[PDB]
Amino acid sequence: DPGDQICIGYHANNSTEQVDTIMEKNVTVTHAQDILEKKHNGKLCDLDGVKPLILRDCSVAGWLLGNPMCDEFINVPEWSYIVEKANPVNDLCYPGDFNDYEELKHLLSRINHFEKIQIIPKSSWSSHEASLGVSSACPYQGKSSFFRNVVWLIKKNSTYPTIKRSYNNTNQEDLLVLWGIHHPNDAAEQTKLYQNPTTYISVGTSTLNQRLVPRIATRSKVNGQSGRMEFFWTILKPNDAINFESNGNFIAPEYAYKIVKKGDSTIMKSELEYGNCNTKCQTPMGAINSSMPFHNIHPLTIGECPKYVKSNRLVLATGLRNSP
Amino acid sequence: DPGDQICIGYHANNSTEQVDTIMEKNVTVTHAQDILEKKHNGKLCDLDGVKPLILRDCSVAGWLLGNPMCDEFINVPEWSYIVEKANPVNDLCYPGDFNDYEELKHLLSRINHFEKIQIIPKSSWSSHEASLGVSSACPYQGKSSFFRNVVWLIKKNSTYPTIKRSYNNTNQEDLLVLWGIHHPNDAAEQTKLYQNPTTYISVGTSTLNQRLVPRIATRSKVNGQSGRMEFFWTILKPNDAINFESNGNFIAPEYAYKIVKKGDSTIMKSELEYGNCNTKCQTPMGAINSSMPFHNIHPLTIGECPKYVKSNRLVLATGLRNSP
Amino acid sequence: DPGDQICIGYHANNSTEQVDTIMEKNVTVTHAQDILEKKHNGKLCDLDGVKPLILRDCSVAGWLLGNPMCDEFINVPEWSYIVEKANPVNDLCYPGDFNDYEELKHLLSRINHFEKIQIIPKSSWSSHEASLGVSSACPYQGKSSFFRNVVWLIKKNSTYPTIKRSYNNTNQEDLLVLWGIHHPNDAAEQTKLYQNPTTYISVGTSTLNQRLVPRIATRSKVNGQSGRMEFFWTILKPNDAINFESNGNFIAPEYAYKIVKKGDSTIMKSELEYGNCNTKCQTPMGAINSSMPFHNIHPLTIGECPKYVKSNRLVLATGLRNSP
Amino acid sequence: XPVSLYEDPLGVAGGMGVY
Amino acid sequence: XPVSLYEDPLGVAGGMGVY
Amino acid sequence: XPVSLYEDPLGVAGGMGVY
Amino acid sequence: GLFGAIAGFIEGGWQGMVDGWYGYHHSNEQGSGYAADKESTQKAIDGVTNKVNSIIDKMNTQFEAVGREFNNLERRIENLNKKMEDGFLDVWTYNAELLVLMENERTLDFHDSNVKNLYDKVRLQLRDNAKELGNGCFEFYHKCDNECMESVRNGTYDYPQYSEEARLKREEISS
Amino acid sequence: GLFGAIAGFIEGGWQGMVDGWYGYHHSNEQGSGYAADKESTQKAIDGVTNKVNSIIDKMNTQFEAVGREFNNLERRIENLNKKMEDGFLDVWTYNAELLVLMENERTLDFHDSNVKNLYDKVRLQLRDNAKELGNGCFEFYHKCDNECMESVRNGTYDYPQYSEEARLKREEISS
Amino acid sequence: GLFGAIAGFIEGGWQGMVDGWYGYHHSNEQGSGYAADKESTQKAIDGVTNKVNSIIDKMNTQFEAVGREFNNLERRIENLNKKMEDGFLDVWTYNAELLVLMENERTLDFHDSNVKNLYDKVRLQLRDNAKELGNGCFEFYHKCDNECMESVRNGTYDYPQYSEEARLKREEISS
Ligand SMILES: *[C@@H]1O[C@H](CO)[C@@H](O)[C@H](O)[C@H]1NC(C)=O
Ligand SMILES: *[C@@H]1O[C@H](CO)[C@@H](O)[C@H](O)[C@H]1NC(C)=O
Ligand SMILES: *[C@@H]1O[C@H](CO)[C@@H](O)[C@H](O)[C@H]1NC(C)=O
Ligand SMILES: *[C@@H]1O[C@H](CO)[C@@H](O)[C@H](O)[C@H]1NC(C)=O
Ligand SMILES: *[C@@H]1O[C@H](CO)[C@@H](O)[C@H](O)[C@H]1NC(C)=O
Ligand SMILES: *[C@@H]1O[C@H](CO)[C@@H](O)[C@H](O)[C@H]1NC(C)=O
Ligand SMILES: *[C@@H]1O[C@H](CO)[C@@H](O)[C@H](O)[C@H]1NC(C)=O
Ligand SMILES: *[C@@H]1O[C@H](CO)[C@@H](O)[C@H](O)[C@H]1NC(C)=O
Ligand SMILES: *[C@@H]1O[C@H](CO)[C@@H](O)[C@H](O)[C@H]1NC(C)=O
């Protein structure tokens, strides 16, 4: 009659977790490991305690040039990343162009802190009117204004003497210098603002050899103006010196930027705003708080992040094929 | 004596199909699936009923500027893709340069239909000779000619008054405007054609601020000419306006292009010509008519195509190792 | 009592080779195959008998322009690859810029042999002083000098007549022509060197239509000089001709380069020097002498090389799991 | 012919059990 | 609870043999 | 030595059966 | 074969079993003939179909080349563009070819193991009521009508039914 | 199952064996109960843990996207940049998804073969001292106290100890 | 081991079998010694050689880096170029390392299954003419000269030749 028995078998449980294989989908297993992070907090937070630089409605150009509507960013502290909207409304209040703009923003994505210094004081213009260069395209508190960091110089007593100003970068750090040129509408306005009919702006450093010349043309009125302002920049190295010579149309430097902290940063394109939180990984859609090796939130992240993948599901089978 | 038997076995057949594995090549199987399309019809066909734009011996520049040898393309209908030969013979009949040409062709690869409109009528030049600008480098029916869509303006009665012409894009669509400048051989020809010795061409829109100046130089004769014609273009947005000012060397716009249909298109480099067929997938070597997931015809395709791979053979084993 | 026996078993040996698997690391096997080359000879050697071009302390610009400190490379023989240091000390002795420099070095990485020819002899300047253009920034044997392959032309008897010189490439090969322009410090030096106040340099070929104009500016002194020399180049095709017109600031061509051998080459960035050896595969850190399919030395190689990978170890298991 | 022993949408057993 | 039958740092057997 | 029991071009059995 | 069944202890295939990948050939004295096992063959067709669809689906996010044009002074970025496109093409060709190789190997082993599992199933069914001939066949220690043939083909074979007639002939053969 | 054990000749799993992936259920007349085999389950947990760490480690050199900006007349290189980044993202998504599919399949087969090896181990231990019921169970031809139960669970079962009592009952059943 | 032979029911390897990956060790009273199975070992060397050549061949279309140079105002495209090249290098390093891991695992399992198939082959040859000791050995129920040793090594063993002397000793052991 039936002898003793011993049977060999395997684990089953209440598990409903499903994994996929090449030959079979939706296979229930006793044990799985989800390895895909699908959740974020929907907020722009500090990165490891350092607060980002949220530019709100101002672009990078409006920030560094000093668009009057960007006074919130007159002297920003050290940041962890920069946030800029897709189409900021406060860009070039006076219409024009920003030469080599994208290369400058690339430079930006490796700087963590600027230190603004006055290299050419607006006071020191004795032979020119340094306080008339204002416009209604750049308004501030109901009265015409202009970019705070550059000086729109005007003739003084129907005279525009030949400016020859030099600045020698005596600091220890690289110095981001910005300047500009005016393109008026006609020779009338040209003489009205600068007296001299054919003008120029020579800029020189150890590697820069530039001579701008104003281009006059009738153009469409943007923000009221048909004239244009075209801005240029360079990185003046320590012990090097920049030289400006001009007889008109000069948008002189006043403040420049000392690059005092470098490191890994980014210009993140996001419509969100500061969310008063902290994270170790930030995306333009929200911060991530996860131990998982993967995520599917956004490809552009900063911090100690999971690796991004486009999948909606990524689950490893650890246990057995689970019996019903 | 021998009891009844039952044997367990497996399928064999007449199959000669071979698959490869890591450890063994050319393994015969009872059942395989070829997944690689290796055949095409050798013809350039319509894409889902829409006929392409075959430029034959004319380049993109000769088409849009109106090289007299390109009259077949004076008013092309909506297309599915564009076809251009590797080295078209009808390009710039009058030798010169096409500024930002490759960016313009990139723009092209997303447009399906132009609509040519006359924005500056060749009639309306009362103070200049608008019908003398012809050349033997651009011949048409045995008599000197020029690009049909731009006007080579000449002095009238030893006078070239300062043109100031503006066009305001009143349409709903973007407008591709083209214009140009003449570089003559010497100051002699300069005065002979335009009277004024130092000339210019200012162009202005809401974002464009251009001032061209003719460059005189002795050059090699290409297609008979040592002078050059340099062409420029822009996309004038709706409600925006373009302004031209010139005292010579102006190759004025006559016809511009209304971008009336956008979508996915391509400039395909092919030496074939129209083959009066239809397809759902086109390559520069022939159309593909296949259900297979892969093909090895050409990397550059358009339509609902298989995925391209460089392999000469791709066969999946579905059945068993087949017995001899 | 115990009948005869036969046992089925498998090989074991003295092997200590270890391989890794997904589920287990450091598994000892009886037989393995290392497939990763980790060793090099630390020398820059000939590539298949052809010696490279070691530029030592001279850059590509100093070589082709003829920086006096680069006389070792006045007429280099056919090479297999070029070697240039990260920051050569003999570059532009007279400070300035090299237009389209990186595109020219890209052209270089497909040329194996130049043949220098005199296209405009320094003798043939009868109306200009062709032997005064020297500088202390370009010294040679304790006396001021200049780039050997271009002529810095000076006024003769307070005169600078309008040069109009043409060279027609009569050879069978493409011809690399180089020339340049001077930017002085002030109008004083401008008249002192060239007499004429407003100068120009027109350059023309079948496709080139250039007109340079000197830019005057006060700049920082580099190697003693605040003036700059800006160099330009082009590839003159056979039967085509180049035309120069100038009234000052012209750095005229003397020697040009006949492209007589093309093929696969490279500009390798290396601090090593010639090691009097031969190899079939070269890296900027040393030559490789290997039959293995992989290596981890450097990504940038030339020759018949293994495939580069970033791993520190790559071992295939061929035999069994080895018993202790 | 017009019937098969198996559900074989892709034909991985091409012809086996079709009559 | 605070002890397990197995060394399971990643929890590939989640809960099996922990008491 | 100069002979082997096996066809082993790559030496995946390094030395096994060579005399 | 990884599992030693196909071209292993079963040396060849059956051209006569035409409506199945795996199956049986019986030979009692009612007669002899082939019969396909359709549950296992349909399970295998399911697996192979899902494998084909898996490969093809995983390959629909593969790189698509784009025509781009550059002028005489943009040779660096034209070369960059060409090497970008050729690199992605080489990557996806490697992916396709290697996936095909690996999954071909695994498919052949899958069929091998299916045969082996069928054989083991009926061997475990019959136990000592049959001698294991070593070539994929079982010699019955009793007599099996065409219906206990289907009973071993459908997994409902009663060992205690013929237990002691099989033990009859087992004791007989042992002397 | 590639090895025919899980959901094969062993048809289902044991909800009652709660502290092990594989193991035994004994039933002698001292009683019956479940006991997990912890050597095999811990070996399997080692393998699965190393597999998870292997996948995650191989994925830490994967491509990281970078924001880059271009102006209205740089549409060619902006398109090039976008397709470069999207191509690398598609490549690494393919890598992750496909590695997960393949290693899931191999993990399930790994558990299957672990069960099969356990069964074969105790079958080879017991030999003809037990009848093989064909469902994962062995019916002892002798009597097995709760301690020869642990003797077959720890691999130290003495066949010649009960050799001839098993041969007793084998000769008995044969008549 | 996936197949339970190597380091499974066969616990260790033979340092004494020096001219073969798999093989036999016989012990009749003419003597005892090792003999390699060269058909199986050569089949395995074929498989492993083709695998090595397969890996190396699939890797010859791998990405090759190219030196490219950029100036101070081309930092965007220089960064793009660097990330393109490093991305392709990371991709191909992943491919190589992962293919090596996977194929190493499959090679070890391949050797395991070769051993298992050899063992099963001679077990199916001998059937009840030998007792299965459970460690890779068979104890002959008759006497096997050094030539039926080669008869079991070359697959030509006649079961009905010693059928009833084996049945002699089987009936003897059963009492
Ligand atoms: C797997 O399950 C999901 C829902 O959980 C379903 O959407 C999907 O279609 C299923 N896959 C298959 C192959 O049935
Ligand atoms: C063009 O005309 C429209 C009238 O439809 C006007 O609104 C717009 O301001 C004009 N643009 C310019 C630049 O004059
Ligand atoms: C999220 O971060 C907070 C702060 O460090 C932490 O308390 C919390 O545990 C994290 N989330 C999870 C799920 O651990
Ligand atoms: C496989 O067969 C083809 C011809 O059908 C032959 O060219 C190739 O060399 C064969 N491969 C091997 C490894 O023999
Ligand atoms: C250059 O000289 C050749 C004579 O060999 C002539 O055919 C060609 O037209 C000349 N080119 C120019 C631009 O004068
Ligand atoms: C090719 O396309 C035509 C038109 O739709 C169709 O009739 C034909 O069946 C297609 N080719 C194949 C092989 O199906
Ligand atoms: C494998 O061995 C190396 C030293 O040979 C050691 O550094 C490494 O940590 C070992 N790996 C593991 C998983 O123990
Ligand atoms: C700038 O000033 C420093 C003094 O600290 C001097 O060494 C340097 O040469 C100056 N540079 C120029 C261009 O004058
Ligand atoms: C290295 O190259 C030399 C010269 O051809 C050759 O003699 C030597 O054998 C090579 N190294 C090895 C390890 O074979």
PDB file of C-alpha atoms in Angstrom, chain A residues 1-14 19-25 27 29-31 33 35 84 102-103 105-106 109 266-267 269 293-294 299-301 307-324, chain H residues 6-7 10-15 17-18 20-29 48 52 55-56 59-60 62 64-67 69-71 89-90 93 97 100-101 104-105 107-108 111 115 118-119 122 133 136-140 143-144 149 152:
ATOM      1  CA  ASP A   1       0.000   0.000   0.000  1.00  0.00           C
ATOM      2  CA  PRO A   2       1.244   3.566  -0.773  1.00  0.00           C
ATOM      3  CA  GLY A   3       4.784   4.051   0.503  1.00  0.00           C
ATOM      4  CA  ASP A   4       6.176   7.348   1.742  1.00  0.00           C
ATOM      5  CA  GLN A   5       6.545  10.163  -0.786  1.00  0.00           C
ATOM      6  CA  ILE A   6       8.703  13.203  -1.407  1.00  0.00           C
ATOM      7  CA  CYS A   7       7.958  15.663  -4.210  1.00  0.00           C
ATOM      8  CA  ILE A   8      10.136  18.351  -5.781  1.00  0.00           C
ATOM      9  CA  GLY A   9       8.377  21.604  -6.556  1.00  0.00           C
ATOM     10  CA  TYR A  10       8.666  25.347  -6.758  1.00  0.00           C
ATOM     11  CA  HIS A  11       7.330  28.605  -5.365  1.00  0.00           C
ATOM     12  CA  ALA A  12       3.994  30.193  -6.233  1.00  0.00           C
ATOM     13  CA  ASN A  13       2.375  33.276  -4.729  1.00  0.00           C
ATOM     14  CA  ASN A  14      -0.208  36.070  -5.078  1.00  0.00           C
ATOM     15  CA  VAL A  19       7.172  40.640 -17.737  1.00  0.00           C
ATOM     16  CA  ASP A  20       7.689  40.242 -21.473  1.00  0.00           C
ATOM     17  CA  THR A  21       9.954  37.911 -23.435  1.00  0.00           C
ATOM     18  CA  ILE A  22      10.780  37.492 -27.113  1.00  0.00           C
ATOM     19  CA  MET A  23       8.316  34.603 -27.472  1.00  0.00           C
ATOM     20  CA  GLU A  24       5.619  35.681 -25.002  1.00  0.00           C
ATOM     21  CA  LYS A  25       4.166  38.898 -23.585  1.00  0.00           C
ATOM     22  CA  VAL A  27       3.915  36.649 -18.385  1.00  0.00           C
ATOM     23  CA  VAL A  29       6.000  36.129 -12.380  1.00  0.00           C
ATOM     24  CA  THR A  30       6.329  35.611  -8.645  1.00  0.00           C
ATOM     25  CA  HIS A  31       8.941  38.384  -8.413  1.00  0.00           C
ATOM     26  CA  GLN A  33      11.829  44.554 -10.452  1.00  0.00           C
ATOM     27  CA  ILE A  35      13.565  49.655 -13.284  1.00  0.00           C
ATOM     28  CA  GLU A  84      14.830  80.333 -19.923  1.00  0.00           C
ATOM     29  CA  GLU A 102      24.379  80.917 -29.648  1.00  0.00           C
ATOM     30  CA  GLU A 103      28.125  80.553 -29.108  1.00  0.00           C
ATOM     31  CA  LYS A 105      24.987  80.812 -24.640  1.00  0.00           C
ATOM     32  CA  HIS A 106      27.216  77.765 -25.156  1.00  0.00           C
ATOM     33  CA  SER A 109      26.317  76.589 -20.099  1.00  0.00           C
ATOM     34  CA  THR A 266      22.971  74.293 -18.504  1.00  0.00           C
ATOM     35  CA  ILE A 267      20.454  76.619 -20.098  1.00  0.00           C
ATOM     36  CA  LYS A 269      14.232  75.546 -21.753  1.00  0.00           C
ATOM     37  CA  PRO A 293      18.469  53.065 -13.150  1.00  0.00           C
ATOM     38  CA  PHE A 294      16.130  54.402 -15.865  1.00  0.00           C
ATOM     39  CA  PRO A 299      16.080  63.600 -22.388  1.00  0.00           C
ATOM     40  CA  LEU A 300      17.589  66.889 -21.112  1.00  0.00           C
ATOM     41  CA  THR A 301      18.448  66.559 -17.415  1.00  0.00           C
ATOM     42  CA  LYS A 307      19.539  57.103 -17.664  1.00  0.00           C
ATOM     43  CA  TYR A 308      16.826  58.280 -20.047  1.00  0.00           C
ATOM     44  CA  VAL A 309      14.919  55.856 -22.280  1.00  0.00           C
ATOM     45  CA  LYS A 310      11.839  56.313 -24.471  1.00  0.00           C
ATOM     46  CA  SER A 311      10.019  53.201 -23.216  1.00  0.00           C
ATOM     47  CA  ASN A 312       6.704  53.243 -21.361  1.00  0.00           C
ATOM     48  CA  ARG A 313       7.574  50.082 -19.402  1.00  0.00           C
ATOM     49  CA  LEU A 314      10.772  48.274 -18.385  1.00  0.00           C
ATOM     50  CA  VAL A 315      10.394  45.408 -15.896  1.00  0.00           C
ATOM     51  CA  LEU A 316      12.938  42.692 -15.093  1.00  0.00           C
ATOM     52  CA  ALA A 317      11.805  39.205 -14.145  1.00  0.00           C
ATOM     53  CA  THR A 318      13.578  38.000 -11.002  1.00  0.00           C
ATOM     54  CA  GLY A 319      11.352  35.093  -9.931  1.00  0.00           C
ATOM     55  CA  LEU A 320       9.549  32.170 -11.546  1.00  0.00           C
ATOM     56  CA  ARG A 321       6.666  31.844 -13.958  1.00  0.00           C
ATOM     57  CA  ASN A 322       3.834  32.194 -11.453  1.00  0.00           C
ATOM     58  CA  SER A 323       1.121  29.509 -11.316  1.00  0.00           C
ATOM     59  CA  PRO A 324      -2.577  30.584 -11.329  1.00  0.00           C
TER      60      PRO A 324
ATOM     61  CA  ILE H   6       8.196  24.285 -14.343  1.00  0.00           C
ATOM     62  CA  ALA H   7       4.680  23.991 -15.789  1.00  0.00           C
ATOM     63  CA  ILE H  10       5.575  19.422 -12.484  1.00  0.00           C
ATOM     64  CA  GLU H  11       2.270  21.039 -13.370  1.00  0.00           C
ATOM     65  CA  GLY H  12       1.897  23.822 -10.785  1.00  0.00           C
ATOM     66  CA  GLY H  13       3.622  25.738  -8.025  1.00  0.00           C
ATOM     67  CA  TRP H  14       3.293  25.532  -4.249  1.00  0.00           C
ATOM     68  CA  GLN H  15       1.709  28.467  -2.449  1.00  0.00           C
ATOM     69  CA  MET H  17       6.357  26.681   0.233  1.00  0.00           C
ATOM     70  CA  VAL H  18       6.674  30.331   1.228  1.00  0.00           C
ATOM     71  CA  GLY H  20      12.040  29.313  -0.982  1.00  0.00           C
ATOM     72  CA  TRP H  21      11.988  29.409  -4.778  1.00  0.00           C
ATOM     73  CA  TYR H  22      12.548  25.645  -5.052  1.00  0.00           C
ATOM     74  CA  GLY H  23      12.194  22.881  -2.499  1.00  0.00           C
ATOM     75  CA  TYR H  24      10.525  19.696  -1.341  1.00  0.00           C
ATOM     76  CA  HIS H  25       7.252  18.471   0.119  1.00  0.00           C
ATOM     77  CA  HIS H  26       7.550  15.239   2.076  1.00  0.00           C
ATOM     78  CA  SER H  27       4.817  12.886   3.229  1.00  0.00           C
ATOM     79  CA  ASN H  28       5.825  10.021   5.489  1.00  0.00           C
ATOM     80  CA  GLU H  29       3.669   8.766   8.306  1.00  0.00           C
ATOM     81  CA  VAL H  48      19.747  36.955 -10.488  1.00  0.00           C
ATOM     82  CA  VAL H  52      20.529  42.822 -12.434  1.00  0.00           C
ATOM     83  CA  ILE H  55      22.458  45.111 -16.831  1.00  0.00           C
ATOM     84  CA  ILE H  56      22.505  48.316 -14.781  1.00  0.00           C
ATOM     85  CA  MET H  59      23.893  50.876 -19.033  1.00  0.00           C
ATOM     86  CA  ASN H  60      25.869  53.600 -17.197  1.00  0.00           C
ATOM     87  CA  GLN H  62      24.727  55.288 -22.203  1.00  0.00           C
ATOM     88  CA  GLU H  64      23.357  61.689 -22.394  1.00  0.00           C
ATOM     89  CA  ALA H  65      21.586  64.381 -24.392  1.00  0.00           C
ATOM     90  CA  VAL H  66      22.864  67.968 -24.384  1.00  0.00           C
ATOM     91  CA  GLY H  67      20.923  71.143 -25.110  1.00  0.00           C
ATOM     92  CA  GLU H  69      20.958  76.181 -29.780  1.00  0.00           C
ATOM     93  CA  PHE H  70      21.066  77.424 -33.369  1.00  0.00           C
ATOM     94  CA  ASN H  71      19.862  80.476 -35.272  1.00  0.00           C
ATOM     95  CA  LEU H  89      18.360  57.807 -27.760  1.00  0.00           C
ATOM     96  CA  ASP H  90      16.695  55.268 -30.062  1.00  0.00           C
ATOM     97  CA  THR H  93      16.275  52.424 -25.861  1.00  0.00           C
ATOM     98  CA  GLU H  97      14.394  46.950 -24.099  1.00  0.00           C
ATOM     99  CA  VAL H 100      15.480  43.128 -20.828  1.00  0.00           C
ATOM    100  CA  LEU H 101      13.475  40.847 -23.148  1.00  0.00           C
ATOM    101  CA  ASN H 104      13.834  37.818 -18.907  1.00  0.00           C
ATOM    102  CA  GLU H 105      13.547  34.769 -21.163  1.00  0.00           C
ATOM    103  CA  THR H 107      15.910  34.035 -16.275  1.00  0.00           C
ATOM    104  CA  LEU H 108      12.696  32.039 -16.616  1.00  0.00           C
ATOM    105  CA  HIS H 111      14.588  28.834 -12.839  1.00  0.00           C
ATOM    106  CA  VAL H 115      13.988  22.873 -10.664  1.00  0.00           C
ATOM    107  CA  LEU H 118      17.003  19.480  -8.123  1.00  0.00           C
ATOM    108  CA  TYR H 119      14.636  16.747  -9.311  1.00  0.00           C
ATOM    109  CA  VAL H 122      17.329  13.372  -5.779  1.00  0.00           C
ATOM    110  CA  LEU H 133       5.555   8.872 -10.193  1.00  0.00           C
ATOM    111  CA  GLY H 136       7.836  15.405  -9.524  1.00  0.00           C
ATOM    112  CA  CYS H 137       7.196  12.843  -6.769  1.00  0.00           C
ATOM    113  CA  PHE H 138       8.945   9.651  -5.678  1.00  0.00           C
ATOM    114  CA  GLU H 139       7.152   6.798  -3.906  1.00  0.00           C
ATOM    115  CA  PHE H 140       9.632   5.178  -1.533  1.00  0.00           C
ATOM    116  CA  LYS H 143      10.014   3.716   4.836  1.00  0.00           C
ATOM    117  CA  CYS H 144      11.640   7.128   5.199  1.00  0.00           C
ATOM    118  CA  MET H 149      13.910  13.106   4.390  1.00  0.00           C
ATOM    119  CA  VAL H 152      17.677  13.371   0.657  1.00  0.00           C
TER     120      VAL H 152
END
